[PDB]
Amino acid sequence: EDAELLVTVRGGRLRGIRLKTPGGPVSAFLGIPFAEPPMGPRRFLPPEPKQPWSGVVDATTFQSVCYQYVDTLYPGFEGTEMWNPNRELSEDCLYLNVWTPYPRPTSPTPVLVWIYGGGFYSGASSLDVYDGRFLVQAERTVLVSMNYRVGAFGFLALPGSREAPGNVGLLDQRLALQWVQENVAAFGGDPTSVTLFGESAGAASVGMHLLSPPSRGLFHRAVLQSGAPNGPWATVGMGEARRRATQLAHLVGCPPTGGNDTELVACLRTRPAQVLVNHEWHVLPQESVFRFSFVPVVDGDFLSDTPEALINAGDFHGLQVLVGVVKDEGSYFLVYGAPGFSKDNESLISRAEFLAGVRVGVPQVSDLAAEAVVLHYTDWLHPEDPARLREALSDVVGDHNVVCPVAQLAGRLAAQGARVYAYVFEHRASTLSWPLWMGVPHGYEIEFIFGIPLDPSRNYTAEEKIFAQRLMRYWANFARTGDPNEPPKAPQWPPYTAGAQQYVSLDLRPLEVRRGLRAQACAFWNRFLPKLLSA
Amino acid sequence: EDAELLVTVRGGRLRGIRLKTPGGPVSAFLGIPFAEPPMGPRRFLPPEPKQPWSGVVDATTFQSVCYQYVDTLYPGFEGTEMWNPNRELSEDCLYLNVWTPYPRPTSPTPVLVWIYGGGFYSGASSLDVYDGRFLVQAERTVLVSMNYRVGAFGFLALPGSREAPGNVGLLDQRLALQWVQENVAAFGGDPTSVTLFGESAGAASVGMHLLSPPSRGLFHRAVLQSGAPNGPWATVGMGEARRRATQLAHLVGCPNDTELVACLRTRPAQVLVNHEWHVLPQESVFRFSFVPVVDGDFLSDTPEALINAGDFHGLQVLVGVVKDEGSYFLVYGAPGFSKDNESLISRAEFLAGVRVGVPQVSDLAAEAVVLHYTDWLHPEDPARLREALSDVVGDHNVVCPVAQLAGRLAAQGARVYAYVFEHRASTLSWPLWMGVPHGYEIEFIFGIPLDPSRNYTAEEKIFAQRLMRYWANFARTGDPNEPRDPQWPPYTAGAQQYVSLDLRPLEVRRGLRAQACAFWNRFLPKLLSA
Ligand SMILES: *[C@@H]1O[C@H](CO[C@@H]2O[C@@H](C)[C@@H](O)[C@@H](O)[C@@H]2O)[C@@H](O[C@@H]2O[C@H](CO)[C@@H](O)[C@H](O)[C@H]2NC(C)=O)[C@H](O)[C@H]1NC(C)=O
Ligand SMILES: *[C@@H]1O[C@H](CO[C@@H]2O[C@@H](C)[C@@H](O)[C@@H](O)[C@@H]2O)[C@@H](O[C@@H]2O[C@H](CO)[C@@H](O)[C@H](O)[C@H]2NC(C)=O)[C@H](O)[C@H]1NC(C)=O
Ligand SMILES: COc1ccc2c3c1O[C@H]1C[C@@H](O)C=C[C@@]31CCN(C)C2
Numbered sequence A: 001e002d003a004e005l006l007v008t009v010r011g012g013r014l015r016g017i018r019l020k021t022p023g024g025p026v027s028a029f030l031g032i033p034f035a036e037p038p039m040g041p042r043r044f045l046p047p048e049p050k051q052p053w054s055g056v057v058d059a060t061t062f063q064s065v066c067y068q069y070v071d072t073l074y075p076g077f078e079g080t081e082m083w084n085p086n087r088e089l090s091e092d093c094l095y096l097n098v099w100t101p102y103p104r105p106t107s108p109t110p111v112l113v114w115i116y117g118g119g120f121y122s123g124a125s126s127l128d129v130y131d132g133r134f135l136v137q138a139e140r141t142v143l144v145s146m147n148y149r150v151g152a153f154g155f156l157a158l159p160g161s162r163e164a165p166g167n168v169g170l171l172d173q174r175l176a177l178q179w180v181q182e183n184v185a186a187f188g189g190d191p192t193s194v195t196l197f198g199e200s201a202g203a204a205s206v207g208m209h210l211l212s213p214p215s216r217g218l219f220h221r222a223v224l225q226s227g228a229p230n231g232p233w234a235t236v237g238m239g240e241a242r243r244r245a246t247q248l249a250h251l252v253g254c255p256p257t258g259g260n261d262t263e264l265v266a267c268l269r270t271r272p273a274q275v276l277v278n279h280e281w282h283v284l285p286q287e288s289v290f291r292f293s294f295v296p297v298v299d300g301d302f303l304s305d306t307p308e309a310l311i312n313a314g315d316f317h318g319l320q321v322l323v324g325v326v327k328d329e330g331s332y333f334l335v336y337g338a339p340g341f342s343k344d345n346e347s348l349i350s351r352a353e354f355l356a357g358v359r360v361g362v363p364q365v366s367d368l369a370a371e372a373v374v375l376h377y378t379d380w381l382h383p384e385d386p387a388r389l390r391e392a393l394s395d396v397v398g399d400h401n402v403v404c405p406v407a408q409l410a411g412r413l414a415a416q417g418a419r420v421y422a423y424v425f426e427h428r429a430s431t432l433s434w435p436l437w438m439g440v441p442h443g444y445e446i447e448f449i450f451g452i453p454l455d456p457s458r459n460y461t462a463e464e465k466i467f468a469q470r471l472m473r474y475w476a477n478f479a480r481t482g483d484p485n486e487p488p489k490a491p492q493w494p495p496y497t498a499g500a501q502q503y504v505s506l507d508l509r510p511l512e513v514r515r516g517l518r519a520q521a522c523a524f525w526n527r528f529l530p531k532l533l534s535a
Numbered sequence B: 001e002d003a004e005l006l007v008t009v010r011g012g013r014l015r016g017i018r019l020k021t022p023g024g025p026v027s028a029f030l031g032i033p034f035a036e037p038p039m040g041p042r043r044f045l046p047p048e049p050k051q052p053w054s055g056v057v058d059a060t061t062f063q064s065v066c067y068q069y070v071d072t073l074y075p076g077f078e079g080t081e082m083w084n085p086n087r088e089l090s091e092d093c094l095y096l097n098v099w100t101p102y103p104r105p106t107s108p109t110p111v112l113v114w115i116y117g118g119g120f121y122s123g124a125s126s127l128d129v130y131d132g133r134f135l136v137q138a139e140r141t142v143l144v145s146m147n148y149r150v151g152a153f154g155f156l157a158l159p160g161s162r163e164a165p166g167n168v169g170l171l172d173q174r175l176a177l178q179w180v181q182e183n184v185a186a187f188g189g190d191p192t193s194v195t196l197f198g199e200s201a202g203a204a205s206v207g208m209h210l211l212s213p214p215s216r217g218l219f220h221r222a223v224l225q226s227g228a229p230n231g232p233w234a235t236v237g238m239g240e241a242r243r244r245a246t247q248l249a250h251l252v253g254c255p256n257d258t259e260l261v262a263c264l265r266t267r268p269a270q271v272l273v274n275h276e277w278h279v280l281p282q283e284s285v286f287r288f289s290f291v292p293v294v295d296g297d298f299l300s301d302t303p304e305a306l307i308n309a310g311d312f313h314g315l316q317v318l319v320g321v322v323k324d325e326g327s328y329f330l331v332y333g334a335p336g337f338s339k340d341n342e343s344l345i346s347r348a349e350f351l352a353g354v355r356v357g358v359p360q361v362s363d364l365a366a367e368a369v370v371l372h373y374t375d376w377l378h379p380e381d382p383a384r385l386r387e388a389l390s391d392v393v394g395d396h397n398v399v400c401p402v403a404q405l406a407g408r409l410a411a412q413g414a415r416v417y418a419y420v421f422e423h424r425a426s427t428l429s430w431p432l433w434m435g436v437p438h439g440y441e442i443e444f445i446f447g448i449p450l451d452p453s454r455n456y457t458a459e460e461k462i463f464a465q466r467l468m469r470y471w472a473n474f475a476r477t478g479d480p481n482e483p484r485d486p487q488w489p490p491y492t493a494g495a496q497q498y499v500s501l502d503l504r505p506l507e508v509r510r511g512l513r514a515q516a517c518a519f520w521n522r523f524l525p526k527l528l529s530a
């Protein structure tokens, strides 16, 4: 028996595994139960803490993926399969993972906690791209990641009811953070230096923990990659959540529409998990891209008000945040619905297809609102150029859903006391399989932040390995000190501020400082458009 | 006795005067009456044709200026005085002027007809800057300009009423155009080749003649300089016209339309002038009290509607703008502006300036303006705020109405030529920050730089000569171009080509502020309809 691979946490004893990494051994504790399995009667309910156990639990492999829709748009394509589940689907999925240096740190070590994305309907901490071994080895931090319920299982809400209160997926995340506080020290981790990070839906989740006081005491810093809690896709109002829940129930035979919430939920609880998943997409109000059926609900509880309001009206002194976007936030989403789009051709759309795309990309707004979008994204010296139109629709979708929500967050946090750092990730991986026109799409900085290029079995260039090490260093510097900059002659990454609005480009070249996160575009989305929607 | 200066027109006999230019003499007939004096009972009424006279009318000097407000913002300043009346004010002001080559052309000569601007409340055909002598000498056209009633006298309207029907100043212009049809041959002019040109409110006037069928047969080509009939300032609705006429009556102590007009008719002209400004519904720049009214008669619909629904095959138009349409108007009411400093305003002033420059719109509409015209990387930079507010006022009032006219006309059969005039005159007395302001291409079109007693460079003289040639070429053929050697292409809705006019050779460019005009012409109307 190896002492390094044995750990006692509040619930009982654990046995882990020793991982080989290019730079030396790391201890991994994979598949640690942190909640009672949300099975049967516990479906849709807040997570209950894992009851203590006798004997030794083997934390030696990733546990099951929470139930979720499995993408089949491009079967076998690396760009899709890399995000699909790599363990069996089960409702019994509430497990977290701890990676620690080998041997275990002697003094308390800063902790990175990863929260995966997947549009709140998919994802898993077990994916190859979230492998924490390289980060832990390169930077000597402790890394934790958790599974949390997605789709209806995590975010179906009948607001008011005790039986399906909503936001249980976020509560899963909270429970894991509480677990980190109570237990991370046993792995050599410092519960007083915990940095959350997540991408997309995971980034939006991070932001929601920022805006929810019971979560806010469980970490100290935040990293939001390509996502913000205030994005128009990340939350839903109480009535729209109820409408969607009720529509799903109706689609699967419950009750034999609406009625007693207790009874409706009881009928949903008898439906096989896969049955719910198969009907998930059918509850959305209109045809769209970047819209997902079951997402966090603004119900006054987890979120006391909309994330926009909470951001605008919050005191963020003492908080450090790192935020950023990839170069082409919108391109990935266009090949999943927008007319005229494919990863397999140039997607050189016509004007009519562009206008149609605007309604898909900006769903459920007035015609006037749509006209305003068309006005600001049309080049009136070239209104019909297909390549320009393609780029413009990509910007529309990307600005609306990601860049502008991130910019508003960054700007407001800065103005209200937070030290903020902002980046744009501009490197397109040598191994990227999406067509060239998509540029650097949503989600493709992650592999670099996690140091995946160091994986010997993969075919990244040597420069990309150097780049990955640079990025991990920034992230870990931020985790440790609240500042990504090196504790010399190397170019400095300046704070982002509401006035100067400075951010850095992340690519193979050194840091270049720039101004404004799509400032002209984001003034439209963040300042004007909301006034138009009120009138 | 010089027989070249004796002319007989339908109404009787005229005596002109020989004028000198650096290129030789020209014949001028100035102060020819074309209407009965619109005085007493005739105030506010449509013009009546001038009754025949016996003997010889002295046509050797300019006649009286129509009653109008006199600008005293910068007393004695050249940039203001060159526009002010240079003859006594009188309601007896309906005279026109003819300039012709000397000796008088013995064969049909193409005719240019000038309609002055002045916001529809001022202006005169006698101003130095409208002197026809250089154009006529250099380009051998006949040139006609007329006075027309302005302010309340030309445009006060109680719609429906016989006593003040509105648009009479426009009918003064039409009557002069009719006079040209009937009499211009007696001077060597060819009534079958009449080109209208005008600037600002004059340009708006030309456009209105284009869109009004009884005028459309009195001319053949049109030139619209820094103005358009679809400008948000150039017309007013029946309801607002009535409100303004009513407010004027009240302000001057008058009370039924008949009684109201009758009481107005008893008031000295100067008294109407004194209260003219005070009938506007809000503090503004680029808005004027008495302008043409859309009442179904002269204009059967709004100019925008008429423009969109017209067949313009057979028409050639020359349209254009100066480099800095908005700047001049900012020193007449925009907070923080003066000709005497840098006018480096604050964001607060910029924001206050927007409500002034875009009066009578919703807060939402104003916010949209602020969104479009703010550089969000530099939201508070005074220099940029000054340029942007100039852009707001100029795009909204001039550039974009002109762009729309050009686009629709071109797309509906017209052959259109477009220009931007980008030369700042060496003699210009407005500060450098104003750039090339509204009105300051005119002196070049009329070839004023050829006047020896003025201080233009030799380059500017050559330039004026180029410009006179473009304009006169257009009047002769519907195409400004000289024989090939760089060519001035037609403006089209798609390619949107126009040329820059300055000391350098023609340079072709695309888009009359296309991004900004998309906002004013495409988006903003939709917003206002909701
Ligand atoms: C680019 O591709 C889209 C998507 O169509 C699919 O992908 C292509 C690579 C090709 O294999 C198509 O046959 C596939 O259907 C094309 O848009 C489709 O057009 C067809 C009719 O031509 C229509 O039935 C589909 O509904 C369309 N799909 C969408 C989402 O609009 C598009 O025409 C291609 N562009 C080209 C070829 O220039
Ligand atoms: C530039 O001048 C404007 C206009 O003010 C006038 O012109 C000046 C040259 C000077 O003679 C002023 O005294 C004149 O009144 C200034 O705007 C005015 O500011 C004053 C206070 O100083 C205020 O009471 C007025 O309301 C303002 N007038 C307007 C048009 O709003 C402005 O301050 C000057 N800007 C600078 C210094 O760049
Ligand atoms: C809102 O962002 C997303 C919405 C849906 C999905 C993903 C998103 O971001 C991508 C990267 C990462 O976040 C996980 C999955 C993504 C790629 C895989 N697709 C199939 C699911």
Ligand SMILES: COc1ccc2c3c1O[C@H]1C[C@@H](O)C=C[C@@]31CCN(C)C2
Residues within 6 Å of the ligand: B071, B083, B116, B117, B118, B119, B122, B123, B199, B200, B201, B202, B286, B438, B439
């Ligand atoms: C709408 O344009 C204008 C409104 C009012 C005035 C002028 C305008 O354009 C200028 C040039 C010319 O047309 C005549 C007068 C102008 C300059 C003199 N001021 C005093 C009056």
Ligand SMILES: *[C@@H]1O[C@H](CO)[C@@H](O)[C@H](O)[C@H]1NC(C)=O
Residues within 6 Å of the ligand: A260, A261, A262, A263
């Ligand atoms: C709904 O039905 C259940 C099943 O018996 C019952 O116990 C419960 O009280 C009902 N709830 C409401 C609010 O009617």
